[PDB]
Write a protein that binds this ligand. Sequence first.
Ligand SMILES: O=C(O)CCCc1ccccc1
Ligand SMILES: [Zn+2]
Ligand SMILES: [Zn+2]
Lengths: 137, 699, 731
Amino acid sequence: MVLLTMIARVADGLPLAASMQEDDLQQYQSQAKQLFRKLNEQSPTRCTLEAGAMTFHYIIEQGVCYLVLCEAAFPKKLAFAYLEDLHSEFDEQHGKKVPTVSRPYSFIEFDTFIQKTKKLYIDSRARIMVANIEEVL
Amino acid sequence: TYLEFIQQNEERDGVRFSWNVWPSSRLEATRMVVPVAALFTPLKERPDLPPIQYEPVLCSRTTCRAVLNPLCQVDYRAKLWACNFCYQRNQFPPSYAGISELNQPAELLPQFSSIEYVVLRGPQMPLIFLYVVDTCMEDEDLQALKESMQMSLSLLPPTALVGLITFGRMVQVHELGCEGISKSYVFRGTKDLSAKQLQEMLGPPPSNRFLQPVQKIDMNLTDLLGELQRDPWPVPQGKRPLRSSGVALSIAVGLLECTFPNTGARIMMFIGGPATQGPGMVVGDELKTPIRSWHDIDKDNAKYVKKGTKHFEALANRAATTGHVIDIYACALDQTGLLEMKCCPNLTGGYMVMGDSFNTSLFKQTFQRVFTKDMHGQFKMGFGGTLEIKTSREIKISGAIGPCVSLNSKGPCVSENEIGTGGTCQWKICGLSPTTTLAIYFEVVGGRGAIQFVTQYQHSSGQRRIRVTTIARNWADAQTQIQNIAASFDQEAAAILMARLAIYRAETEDVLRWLDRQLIRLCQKFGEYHKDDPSSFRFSETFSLYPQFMFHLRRSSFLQVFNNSPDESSYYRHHFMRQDLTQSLIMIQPILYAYSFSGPPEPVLLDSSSILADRILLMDTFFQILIYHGETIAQENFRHLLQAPVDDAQEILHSRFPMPRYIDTEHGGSQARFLLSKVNDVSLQVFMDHLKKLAVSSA
Amino acid sequence: EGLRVVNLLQERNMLPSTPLKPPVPNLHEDIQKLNCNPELFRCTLTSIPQTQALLNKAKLPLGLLLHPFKDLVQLPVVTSSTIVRCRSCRTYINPFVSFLDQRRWKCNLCYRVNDVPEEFLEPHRRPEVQNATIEFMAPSEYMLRPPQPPVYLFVFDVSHNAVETGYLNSVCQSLLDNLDLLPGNTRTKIGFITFDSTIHFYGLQESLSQPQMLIVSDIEDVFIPMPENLLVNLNESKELVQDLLKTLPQMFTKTLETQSALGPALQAAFKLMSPTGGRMSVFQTQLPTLGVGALKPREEPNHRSSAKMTPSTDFYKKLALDCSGQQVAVDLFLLSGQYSDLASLGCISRYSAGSVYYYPSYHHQHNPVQVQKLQKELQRYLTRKIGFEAVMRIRCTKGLSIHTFHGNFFVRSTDLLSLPNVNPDAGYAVQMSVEESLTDTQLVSFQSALLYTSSKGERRIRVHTLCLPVVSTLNDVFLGADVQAISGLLANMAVDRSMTASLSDARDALVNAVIDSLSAYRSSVPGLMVPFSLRLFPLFVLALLKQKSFQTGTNARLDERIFAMCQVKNQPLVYLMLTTHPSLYRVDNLSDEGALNISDRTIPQPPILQLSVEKLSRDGAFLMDAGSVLMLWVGKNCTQNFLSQVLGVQNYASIPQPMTDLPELDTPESARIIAFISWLREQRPFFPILYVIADESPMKANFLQNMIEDRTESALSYYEFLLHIQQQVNK
Ligand SMILES: O=C(O)CCCc1ccccc1
Ligand SMILES: [Zn+2]
Ligand SMILES: [Zn+2]
């Protein structure tokens, strides 16, 4: 029921936009980048990975992977609706520049929309495939 | 007429006794079945008594100091009077030098057996209102709550001081009218604070930065109340909001305790759910675990109750000792924690309002009834009431049952056998109204026994006032003891006073076993029967309704707690321990009226046989007003019948303070269950038959 | 030029009339023409001793002084898909590498040969090899997290004393004027905290009619009261932060709060920034006396008290380390009129790569100097560029070892400097020693590199590389000595000797630095003979001993001395020289020998005078460039043309007592002196205020406290200093 959002270009795993808040992040941010590395043109376009007390959820559109991590208790139904809201906005704004950039995090300013959209999902008042993550790695 | 006597005495003195004739012997005082007790209403309204602006005149005897009353022997020639309690002869004060027999003091006329004095010596303190508002609730509930408090603000006296404390996960003590900011002091709702700590952490008519006159602050508070928003902290999935009610109250208590102790103040708490964090926690934040029930508490599956009840219990004693009132207004679909918080409005004079949502006409109307004004525009509420009772040397006081706190004042009128809040001749009542009814239980250790009720309280005008009710009842004639005693029995008042004793023992734990051994003992001592012949048993017209009252009491929701939530059980007993006689009777035995073409509306028995198919019923439980349509009527003459009970309902809907819940149901409707459960061991027929079998056999 | 020996006892005016210039390393023409700009990176000994035994003989300190984030006129920004770094020591590909196979290059720091990648393609024409100063784009592996946003948290003291100084009115005015100029993109966050006995947060929401002042009173157990709108988006909430800045000074006029809970407030300001990090601007005006981190009062010394510094608590040091681990840097604005234990408060800025700013006896009415000083120093503070969550590594060629670091940072792993912020006005220093004899090499290189997150959200690496020759002759070491750089490194070394030992031992080690080196020089060749490169060495050490950091017989107070030591540790070498030995010019008679090339401006170039009253003249006027201020002393018998045509006054008596700046009059005499002053302040970003207040009787003649060559009742003159050195050189 917490946060971790990464938007990367699937070809190289180039980070495009992310968002993290703590007050550890070091381990699951590693597995996130191990995943972006393995992802290729044959990977499932939608998936869910089990990481013990945590659980990854990602979709893929236009060669862009939208990854999210949370505690396994978080409704998987909501996680993909969260990634869908990110993609449609991100694709609408930066979909045509993704295959041209070469800097890491060339869309840091997408930080804004990530966190204002994130809050609409981590508050109950506001209102595919499964595989253990240790395998794919 | 013994009924004319009981009527007029309650109309004049606001009191009703179990027995109007008292045992003149030691052998009859010990063998009293229903104890000598009184249903006393210290502030009862009546036909415009003259407020006495002069000093009361008290007896000149250190231990006695009773108030001049109609039972005092006067001597207008010598300008003397003898105190009827201690026989002490007194001299009249200088203001009474012009005293004459053709122009006498009001306090001596038997019409003014109950009278009110006003003491105008010190400057009058302002009233203090402290809104303690929860923010963990839906927007429609919060916006409705915001609208309710803005309306109550527009009715407060301009001199009255106001404070605002909002809370959710944190507790916020607002500093009002700060200009360009509107700051607030934020505290963790996780650890408790004393009055002293809070005073350190925080800092011509008086006031504070936190408590300010309405006339100078109302415009800023009505804008703050309109800008209040829900607790900004998020609620994760499957979780309850972090709601720190236990600390928010202890901060409202400590705030007033260190700023205006010993003065009329109203801590009005508005709850939208249970306390999920800190001391005084009701339930954890896991939605998976439901709030406790009567089943859970009996099977030792409610780990928060005792620890939670104990927290608000000390808060109640703090605010009661300091002399402050704690109201609690709860409106949520789940439970709220009234079972653990009941001590605060019970030990003070605080109100306890319950509902499903602040966005109902049920709450909105009930809330504005709190601020009902009389013929002068002043609230029908008093503060800091001190009740002292003077008795003859033959009468001791076992104690009281009702909204009061013992001042632990010792004196010869204190009885060894203490009952309820006993062991004292003085009781503090932080809040009271014209309705507040105490239950005083006496014990006896020619003619006339005497009791005096002195109630000094802070009026809604700020004036210090003293109410003095002096009553007298004949001693039983020796050659006609039990015969005179039986003739004075008030079966209604005794049923409520015996119900008071039972609920008090249940709420402080069998109880039905005691309630039966006294109904049986009353049947044998005052009934008519041949031994071992149950068919022979009759009761006088004085005692005939007492068993039926006991039948509906022993099966009421006040003693059969299951099939109710603990918040509902504590809410039902709360209002019963405060109401007068007539409303208490309605709680135990709801009234039932019938409506049909065949005659005007008529009362009918609370039995299943009263439910006809071609008849509309009106049931009046104090807590709910129900209208039922028999199977036939469930479809200009049909209009009169269909709205005849509606017109009758609207009237009593308004006067009753805790606005009762209205129900429109019919045959087969789900809401018809409330009618079928109050109606009917088993039934009254079997109950009476088993009662007569034990009455006519051994004692 | 000059291999010549100088008899300091006979010369006496050895200070040149033109500005000192940094020495040129004895390097080949083609290697030197690519060497690092000496403003950004320089060494005390431009001729590195080949062995430690040779370094010990010269009795001179070997070390580096760097200004790595300095504003540049032109920066090569390489966006290379691959950053070429030596596979062993990770040194970046620098101009001083050794290309041999045209596809393999030798590292100039650890001598390992590396394969040039099939990207770098003539590989020697690559920009990474044609520039000693260059900025890279760091790839995804050089960042532990996404680029942190620019976060600015301003923590204001609002106690009774703080409200009396009136600083809050100008600070809020500066922020209003410089709101759009704060470095950052649309990801910029800004926050505000005021504190006295309690800690006051300020929530800002578009839904509410006005901000809200959330007060946490539990000083022993602080917390964040609201989760969302304490650090707000400056772009979205521009109007909300503007009303708060216009309202904040007015909220505390009638305050009776006499105490300050700085410790708890810093802890609260830390928790608010710990999630993201950023720059924490703390504005304190008095001794912290309430809560955790409380400091006891101290009695100020007098001229009579001898040399008998350290912090009184480690609270602000521990707290600074916690801020460093969260990429939080704390800048300390101290505007106190009384003692405030800056020796302890300074730890919050030293160990977190912050900078401390000191304004003694600040008052909005009583002290118009500190008012305009703060105004201009804040103008630079809020508008200068900034890098976030930074680290810095200082690399030097094998055999040389760095063993001591100087500056504001946290040192993690030897050669790993933590910079929660990096600012373009910070200076750093390093002390090295010859761990292994440089018999193999004749060149050694030095590399520093700055990994930081830009204000636009881009990981960048600014790299500087310096190459120097190796020598094995005592005279060769002396011929390459940098007298200014040695003065800077010795100042940093003496600050540590003060804390470590005392001000006496710090002053002795400074005096022994001149005695031991020149005694070693004499033993390798009647009067006092020094090499040409060390002819200003006793003069600059003397000025060091009369500076407010190390002076003794003066009436100086505790926080004055501590701040002077903080400026030694944190400022670039140029500002240490301009302060310790200010430049003195005569200005009442400027002419045309100037730099009249600049299109339409002439800009006189008057000669530099030495710091002695004997160079003054009651008939003229004298400007003194102290780096941060420009004091214009006027003579009692000054000319009449100067008064009416430059000062705009008809006589010396009606020169206003505090004069904040010169007038711009329609006179060519004014056009000259305004041209010289305006040219002096263009040589620096920190706008220096110029107060003519130095009259011959304004009671503000601290102008004369910089005449370091003259004698006073408790210090030697310059000639007395040479006399003392010579008795020790040939004892
Ligand atoms: O461990 C390291 O040195 C590589 C990371 C730190 C750094 C980055 C860039 C430049 C210098 C240093
Ligand atoms: Zn008496
Ligand atoms: Zn190398």
